[PDB]
From a paper:
Here, we provide the vaspin crystal structure and identify human kallikrein 7 (hK7) as a first protease target of vaspin inhibited by classical serpin mechanism with high specificity in vitro. We provide evidence that the serpin function of vaspin is essential for its physiologic effects and demonstrate that the anti-diabetic vaspin effects in vivo do not result from increased insulin sensitivity but are rather based on an insulin-stabilizing effect most likely by inhibiting hK7-mediated insulin degradation.
After expression, purification and crystallization of recombinant human vaspin, X-ray structure determination confirmed the typical structural core domains of serpins consisting of three β-sheets and nine α-helices. As expected, nearby regions match closely in a superposition onto related serpins. The fold corresponds to that of free serpins or serpins involved in a transient complex, i.e. the long central β-sheet consists of five strands.
Residue numbers in the entry: 37 to 366, 378 to 414
The structure:
Amino acid sequence: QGWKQRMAAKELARQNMDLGFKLLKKLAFYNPGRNIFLSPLSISTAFSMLCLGAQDSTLDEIKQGFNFRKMPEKDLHEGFHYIIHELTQKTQDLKLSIGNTLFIDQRLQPQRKFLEDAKNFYSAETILTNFQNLEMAQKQINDFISQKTHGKINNLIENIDPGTVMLLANYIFFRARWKHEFDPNVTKEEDFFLEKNSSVKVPMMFRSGIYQVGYDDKLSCTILEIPYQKNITAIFILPDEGKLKHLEKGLQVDTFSRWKTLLSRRVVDVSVPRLHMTGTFDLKKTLSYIGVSKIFEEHGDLTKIAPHRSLKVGEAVHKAELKMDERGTEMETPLVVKIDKPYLLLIYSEKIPSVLFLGKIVNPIGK
């Protein structure tokens, strides 16, 4: 039985939810007017995986920053292994992979125990690279990742600092069928208001059907859920005019559970833009938002990864990628939910609890 693993996953999912909202708040504060697209879950797997090879102050700070402190470490790794194993699929309904690749300088010797544990618990791999040729190391890493993800995760690395002997690449892609397909013949170019006064034409999908829908008077936003065929849900959060900043600032762990209380199944005429979203983050910068930096410094804390005095993670990048289109399986007067102005998007795994993706979409066709 995997009861205990399932309980650990439930606690870890609450933690990625909080992490996602904290990261979104900080990212939106420093960079307003930009799309933000990342996977709190995928980011968490990367640093939890690093806990298998980290000791002392570096280990303690990752666990403090990511709030991995509530359960024993054995349960932390068993919980993440369960989440990854359950979500990892290449079926007609769902294609999801969480990649964790450490690229280590070929002069270093990654330790067997760490290699085995990372592969067994996270499906993470270590690839030897020649960091003395930075240009070639970048092409090698980008080609390795593009080949592994079948062209879903491309150009992951744009720069490698000299002296880097260890680079972490974390990446997640998603393809899923909706529980009910949208008819592509009904998809049309429609106005997407970038601002109250300024608009761009975007491919807008349309379907009339039964959906979990609601309105939050506290955060002044419409909530709409569109289910995928597998137990995953696309949650659209549409702020009222001039309430986006209020919505971002009000986001909490309790916010989400409150949104769930406001929903009911109703007939809705839904208009949703198609998306092909990617988000790329320098994790050294992103993790400063949760006070995690020792992993990026030399402290003699990574000997379990490889013996070497000055060892640190030189660089770490996260890339999240998702396609949202018509693909899927197959009363009362309809409500109308038009997603045609800046919105938040949460891709939520219901069965294996987790926030797979969190997005702030200011422009669905925006790069």
